[PDB]
Amino acid sequence: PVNHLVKEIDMLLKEYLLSGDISEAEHCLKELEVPHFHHELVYEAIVMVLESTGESAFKMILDLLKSLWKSSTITIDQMKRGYERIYNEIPDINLDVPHSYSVLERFVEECFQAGIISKQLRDLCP
């Protein structure tokens, strides 16, 4: 069966892509009280980006992760783990979604330019 937190994080991310309401997404994540599982949010969100068409999800998810990083809602370790998961799976993801390496690189670079990931995590992108 699917982990119920995975389900709540997927719902949260979908409601945010539908509404654009960053504040509601932050509040809904906080209500879960699972700061130990915030890597799942980072991972699920970047997968949505990679699977989307056009530029809109990329931008919405960049804005979400920027906001959640600045409000201290996602911490460094959680950001690190989530990105590491993507880095591990990008070979499999790219098998199904051509040009994902290229989208991931642009996403990683924009997160770096926004100041929300370290140069180290930046450079760790395979």
mmCIF file of C-alpha atoms in Angstrom, residues 7 14 94:
data_model
loop_
_atom_site.group_PDB
_atom_site.id
_atom_site.type_symbol
_atom_site.label_atom_id
_atom_site.label_comp_id
_atom_site.label_asym_id
_atom_site.label_seq_id
_atom_site.Cartn_x
_atom_site.Cartn_y
_atom_site.Cartn_z
ATOM 1 C CA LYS A 7 -0.281 10.603 -0.367
ATOM 2 C CA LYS A 14 -1.240 19.163 -6.563
ATOM 3 C CA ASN A 94 15.503 10.374 -18.167
#
